[PDB]
Design a protein around this ligand. Structure first.
Ligand SMILES: O=C(O)CN(CC(=O)O)C[C@H](Cc1ccc(NC(=S)NCCO)cc1)N(CC(=O)O)CC(=O)O
Ligand SMILES: [In+3]
Lengths: 211, 213
């Protein structure tokens, strides 16, 4: 059994939103004891709903769990700004527990903002070491969701790319950075390098030509 | 007031063993179903194990069966988890949760790696650059260190605004951090910029001045 949830959702403060949890194997039922937990900054978890309906003590009335469709659902009636968190769901399959991938929920507390991207070439000092680390910095983007894709000579570089996960900023915006590692030999063989960051449909591509 | 606090996580070499603890407060362990859950670097949640109350069954994730053992210590109001033929896959923040995951502990990190190493700092300068906003972004690559943390600063506090330090990244048993600064094209190259990095563990102190490419 696989448990699927929406990647991300975005609401504005005061609106009602619904997050769902689908079961690979079949209809979610009462005996899967649908569970909902929230994850806040600095990996702070707290249980919201248990047993498909039951609100943990202390959790505000705003959150509700239920079954709608062949799925388990969490509705946040009149979503508040402090509700921008990650929501995970868990289902019991009479032996084990299966957690879904989590839903990055966004409550717009400020205008949408595009990422400030910048690509750095590999330093001299580094190439000496037979290493070539291309750094792509992604900044002041809001919502906190980005997709990074790397291209070497127009071909999508399928590997050697590691990407950090979004992290808040004091202005409650987010950052991330991606890395592209190659050997100094690899690097020589190519002349066009590109880091393309997509955010809410709009793709910003910062490139560089080596030769 | 219920309190959970796990301890025991440390670096460990692949194939090594560990034993984590979860001390409970606010309730009596015996009559409470407790679980172990792990959050990976990918920021994904995974069920590790559950032990039912009364004196009932204990269930294990397929990814954990045979290698990990859960134990209760009702006498000390402690929950234990033994980890034995450790794999790269097992590196994560481990947490214990109460019945139906209402209360959670703060987590304990277990890193399955090779060994301690001071960082290789690299300065990042723009490639024969321009100035869009009459603003230039400089940086610093803090590479191949172990274990975490690292302290990056710029002109040692002088530069505070325009600083973006990115979370670490672990690839071949070693971390990779990156830091940056944005400055008007007035300050650099006219004035110098230095990234100050300090690796506590290793008692490493390095300063890299960012000069033109
Ligand atoms: O809490 C859990 O992790 C498991 N929960 C599911 C839930 O409460 O959401 C389910 C659990 C009931 C429960 C207990 C055991 C099994 N599996 C058995 S008997 N397998 C037989 C193997 O030979 C299934 C369900 N609890 C139900 C409840 O809380 O009312 C009682 C308990 O936790 O002891
Ligand atoms: In139960």
């Amino acid at each position: 059994a696989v448990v699927t949830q929406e990647s991300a959702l975005t609401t504005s403060p005061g609106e009602t939103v619904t997050l769902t949890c689908r079961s690979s194997t079949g209809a979610v039922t009462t005996s899967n004891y649908a569970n909902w937990v929230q994850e806040k900054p600095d990996h702070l978890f707290t249980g919201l709903i248990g047993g498909t309906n039951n609100r943990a003590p202390g959790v505000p009335a705003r959150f509700s769990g239920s079954l709608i469709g062949d799925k388990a659902a969490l509705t946040i009636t009149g979503a508040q700004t402090e509700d921008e968190a990650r929501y995970f769901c868990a289902l019991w399959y009479s032996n084990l527990w299966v957690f879904g991938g989590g839903t990055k929920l966004t409550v717009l507390g400020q205008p949408k903002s595009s990422p400030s991207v910048t690509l750095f070439p590999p330093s001299s000092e580094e190439l000496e070491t037979n290493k070539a680390t291309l750094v792509c910095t992604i900044i002041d983007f809001y919502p906190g969701v980005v997709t990074v894709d790397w291209k070497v000579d127009g071909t999508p570089v399928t590997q050697g790319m590691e990407t950090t996960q979004p992290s808040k900023q004091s202005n409650n915006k987010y950052m991330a950075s991606s890395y592209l590692t190659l050997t100094a030999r690899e690097w020589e063989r190519h002349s066009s390098y590109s880091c393309q960051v997509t955010h809410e449909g709009h793709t910003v591509e910062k490139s560089l030509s080596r030769a | 007031e219920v309190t959970l606090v796990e301890s025991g996580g440390d670096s460990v070499k692949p194939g090594g063993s560990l034993k984590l603890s979860c001390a409970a407060s606010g309730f009596t362990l015996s009559g409470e179903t407790m679980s172990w859950v792990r959050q990976t670097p990918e920021k994904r949640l995974e069920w590790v194990a559950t032990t039912l109350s009364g004196g009932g069954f204990t269930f294990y994730s397929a990814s954990v069966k045979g290698r990990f053992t859960i134990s209760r210590d009702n006498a000390q109001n402690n929950l234990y988890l033994q980890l034995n033929s450790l794999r790269s896959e097992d590196t994560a923040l481990y947490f214990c949760a109460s019945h139906r995951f209402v209360h959670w502990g703060h987590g304990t990190l277990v890193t399955v790696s090779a060994k301690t190493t001071p960082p290789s700092v690299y300065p990042l300068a723009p490639g024969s650059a321009a100035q869009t906003n009459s603003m230039v972004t400089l940086g610093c690559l803090v590479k191949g260190y172990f274990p975490e943390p690292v302290t990056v600063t710029w002109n040692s506090g002088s530069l505070s605004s325009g600083v973006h330090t990115f979370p670490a990244v672990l690839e071949s048993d070693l971390y990779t951090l990156s830091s940056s600064v944005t400055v008007p094209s007035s300050p650099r190259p006219s004035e110098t910029v230095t990234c100050n990095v300090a690796h506590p563990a290793s008692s490493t102190k390095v300063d890299k001045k960012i000069v033109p490419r």
